[PDB]
């Protein structure tokens, strides 16, 4: 069974660099890359970068640049982030992620298939825009709901969902529009084309009750939706 297991929370002082791990274990290491992500307090994600440990090529988002460098050991089955110049908007909780099995020679979903725990750090002394709707939404057991989820530009299907509990836990559900991932149970559906998609939620269950995010992975950089936060 695949795992990723991150290192413990530290605080920081200003101005200051750090280092933070994510070990790799149950499936071979070298053939997925692993991908990089900051979330803030009551908000969307953000991409930072992926690298490849077979190779050691990496890929940065322009506005972390000057912010991270990422690396990786294949003997040590680890992968490695670095931060420099701290200040106060750097305090959030990051992620670590692999990258799903692709679609063909050369063509990737940008599907995140297996998440870390997350690492938190506390700081003290043109993109692709999705669009989500509702913000939030109640309903109670054995109902139906749909969710609603908008790009800016056409997307060509390539388009992703996600579910995230309050104890911080994210798995994917469905990906490339309508496909459901290992494990998922059938009440759990998507559709959609061009810039317009939605989730369907069949005969709710009390272990639904979360928050759901979609990403879209034409073009780079990966870009998340605010959220739809879904209660009793």
């Known amino acids: 069974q695949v795992q990723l297991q991150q290192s413990g929370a530290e605080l920081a002082k200003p101005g200051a660099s750090m280092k933070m791990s994510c070990r790799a274990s149950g499936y071979s290491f070298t053939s997925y890359w692993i991908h990089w992500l900051k979330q803030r307090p009551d908000q969307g994600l953000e991409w930072i970068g992926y690298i490849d440990p077979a190779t050691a090529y990496t890929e940065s988002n322009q506005k972390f640049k000057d912010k991270a460098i990422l690396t990786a050991d294949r003997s040590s089955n680890t992968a490695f982030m670095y931060l420099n110049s701290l200040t106060s908007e750097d305090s959030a909780v990051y992620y670590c992620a692999r990258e799903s099995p692709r679609l063909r020679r050369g063509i990737y979903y940008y599907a995140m298939d297996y998440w870390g725990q997350g690492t938190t750090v506390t700081v003290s002394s043109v993109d692709i825009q999705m669009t989500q709707t509702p913000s939030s939404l109640s309903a109670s057991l054995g109902d139906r709901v749909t969710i609603s989820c908008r790009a800016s530009?056409?997307?060509?299907?390539?388009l992703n969902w996600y579910q995230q509990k309050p104890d911080g836990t994210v798995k994917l559900l469905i990906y490339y529009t309508s496909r459901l991932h290992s494990g998922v149970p059938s009440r759990f559906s998507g559709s959609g084309s061009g810039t317009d998609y939605s989730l369907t939620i069949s005969n709710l269950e009390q272990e639904d009750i979360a928050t759901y995010f979609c990403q879209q992975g034409n073009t780079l950089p990966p870009t998340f939706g605010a959220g739809t936060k879904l209660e009793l």
């Open positions: 530009q056409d997307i060509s299907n390539y």
